[PDB]
Design a protein around this ligand. Structure first.
Ligand SMILES: Nc1ncnc2c1ncn2[C@@H]1O[C@@H]2COP(=O)(O)O[C@H]2[C@H]1O
Ligand SMILES: Nc1ncnc2c1ncn2[C@@H]1O[C@@H]2COP(=O)(O)O[C@H]2[C@H]1O
Ligand SMILES: Nc1ncnc2c1ncn2[C@@H]1O[C@@H]2COP(=O)(O)O[C@H]2[C@H]1O
Ligand SMILES: Nc1ncnc2c1ncn2[C@@H]1O[C@@H]2COP(=O)(O)O[C@H]2[C@H]1O
Lengths: 199, 198
């Protein structure tokens, strides 16, 4: 749309190959990003290097916004390219001028921030209230209802590794393996290889 | 100044302690601002167990999450801790104010950003730490707040075992047992409703 086209005209755009890191946790934040094309993962880590995926973000999503509103902040998480990405970037200083010219661009950003708070708060609830089986079940269901799901005779077919599931729900790949076997035993899914059919 | 201006467009109401300002699932059409008092933001499970997502205080916006897209529900319960004086304004009126001076939206968004940082950390804590570790980190977090008092042995904080339980996801009895253990390990001290984090 015209508002995003205008905003993007003020950005400089860069390509990140798959698996490259756009944002490192702890970096001093002075830059806003916007995904023109591609997908990323937002990750945090514990003291042993275990990773949890806080969110995937996709085309049309802003990234690196959390430092915009107060000076001297650090990046709160790592952001890694899941595919080749084309990403627009703009200094906080320039973005603030754009906001004065047309606050609709701040409305667009803030809308995403609000949704992220909602979704992350839901995740808190899931971790606090659900067991690992329930979190894995809900994750498989949510992934089957995503745009990139594949139609299957028996339901919706998804592509995700045990490692990635573990990183979403907070458990080892071995634990994912055991729970997935349990779910197939219950005739709720089938596991082919890296492919899972959610009935 | 800009706060004064914003408030002149609001209707201000009083809320006694324990009263619910916002109920989860209600249609969101209104923005609030805490002029005085403190609140807790809470979610519930299927068994009625409650978890505190955040405490908010004077200067905090509340009920902001439905502002940017129509037909959304309140995402959580917000309950008065102390009695509160709360400014209220329709989403429609607020959207007009933003066009006059977007600094009011910058202030609100600054809070959304902080909340996402905090809530994201909570996600990590729940995923990575056992109950003892979560209680420990909670004490550490409280010790960092502005309302924490300096003490010869560290920072003194004020919180109940029920509140800690609601924050970390465990019973008040579990909190009680673990605080005793943590004291034995020479990491904290306790006294009724007051805790010193070494
Ligand atoms: N819970 C979350 N949901 C979605 N995106 C997030 C979340 N936490 C952090 N991020 C993104 O990761 C970025 C890391 O850099 P910033 O903190 O500047 O901005 C952050 C957000 O864009
Ligand atoms: N509580 C947890 N226990 C184990 N692994 C976790 C936890 N939270 C996140 N993870 C990550 O999820 C990953 C799943 O695959 P891995 O076992 O190879 O590595 C795991 C960790 O990096
Ligand atoms: N994770 C959180 N941290 C702080 N405040 C929150 C969080 N989740 C919800 N809230 C507040 O609770 C309110 C519930 O109503 P809204 O969804 O309209 O707006 C929400 C926020 O103001
Ligand atoms: N897993 C859990 N076990 C017990 N209480 C919980 C849990 N998760 C959240 N809570 C809440 O935390 C509260 C701490 O005080 P109560 O024991 O009175 O009531 C508890 C519940 O409402």
């Amino acid at each position: 749309d015209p508002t995003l086209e205008w905003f993007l005209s003020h950005c400089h755009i860069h390509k990140y190959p798959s698996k490259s890191t756009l944002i490192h946790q702890g970096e001093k934040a002075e830059t806003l990003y916007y995904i023109v094309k591609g997908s990323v993962a937002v990750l945090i880590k514990d003291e042993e290097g275990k990773e949890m995926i806080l969110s995937y973000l996709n085309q049309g999503d802003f990234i690196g916004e959390l430092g915009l509103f107060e000076e001297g902040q650090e990046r709160s998480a790592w952001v890694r390219a899941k595919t080749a990405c084309e990403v627009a970037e703009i200094s906080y200083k320039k973005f603030r001028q754009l906001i004065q010219v047309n606050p609709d661009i701040l409305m667009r950003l803030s809308a995403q921030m609000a949704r992220r708070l909602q979704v992350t708060s839901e995740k808190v609830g899931n971790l606090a209230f659900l067991l690992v089986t329930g979190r894995i079940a809900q994750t498989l269901l949510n992934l089957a209802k995503q745009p990139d799901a594949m139609t299957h005779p028996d339901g919706m077919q998804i592509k995700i590794t045990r490692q990635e599931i573990g990183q979403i729900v907070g458990c080892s790949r071995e634990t994912v393996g055991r729970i997935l076997k349990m779910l197939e035993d219950q005739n709720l899914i089938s596991a082919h290889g890296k492919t899972i059919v959610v009935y």
